[PDB]
From Swiss-Prot:
The gene is MRAS. It is linked to Noonan syndrome 11: A form of Noonan syndrome, a disease characterized by short stature, facial dysmorphic features such as hypertelorism, a downward eyeslant and low-set posteriorly rotated ears, and a high incidence of congenital heart defects and hypertrophic cardiomyopathy. Other features can include a short neck with webbing or redundancy of skin, deafness, motor delay, variable intellectual deficits, multiple skeletal defects, cryptorchidism, and bleeding diathesis. Its cofactor is Mg(2+). One of its GO terms (molecular function) is GTP binding. The chain holds residues 10 to 178 of 208 of the full protein. This is Ras-related protein M-Ras.
């Protein structure tokens, strides 16, 4: 019987949650994916030569029953922001407190994902900024890009699973 890791992809709208999720599950880049669907994805994944089932909810939207459950029984979270969106970085703390509130814990597995690093000519959030925010929350930091050709999409999800397994 394989373990099932339930993960939640959270972040402001337009940071690339859907694109990163589609790139991880379907291995294609879908630009301008409709911003409103909040769906979940399920597939068998091999991480560190150990197979597992990944139940990932791509968040969107007020209140949602599906979002509510996945936040409660989730095992790990992906706090995603866009390096071109300063407000998406400003809400990293807000998303950090919501997870710790929903889970009612002082620390829970999460990784800080800085998306859209392919747009270097439009980058507003720096690597030192993301590293400092990650160091403050004591969580891993990684830079991703869902646009073709992708960068670190699998590693972002795999590193969260590694954090879950190490606890
Ligand atoms: N350049 C670049 N654009 C991206 C990337 N990820 C998403 N986008 C674009 O950003 C827009 C919003 O992305 P989306 O996946 O809908 O973000 P979401 O609303 O949080 O799910 C889309 O038009 C995408 O084409 C990326 O890694 N690089
Ligand atoms: Mg989306």
């Amino acid at each position: 019987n394989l373990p099932t890791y339930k993960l939640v992809v959270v972040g402001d709208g337009g940071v690339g949650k859907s694109a990163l999720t589609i790139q991880f599950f379907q291995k294609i880049f879908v630009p301008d994916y409709d911003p409103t669907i909040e769906d979940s994805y399920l597939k068998h994944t091999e991480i560190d030569n150990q197979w597992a089932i990944l139940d990932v909810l791509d968040t969107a939207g007020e209140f949602s029953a599906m979002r509510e459950q996945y936040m409660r029984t989730g095992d790990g979270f992906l706090i995603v922001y866009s390096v071109t969106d300063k407000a998406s970085f400003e809400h990293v703390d807000r998303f950090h407190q919501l997870i710790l509130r929903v889970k009612d814990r002082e620390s829970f597995p999460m990784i800080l994902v800085a998306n859209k690093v392919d747009l270097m000519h439009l980058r507003k959030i720096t690597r030192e900024q993301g590293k400092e925010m990650a160091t403050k929350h004591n969580i891993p930091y990684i830079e991703t890009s869902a646009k073709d050709p992708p960068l670190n999409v699998d590693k972002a999800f795999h590193d969260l699973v590694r954090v879950i397994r190490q606890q």
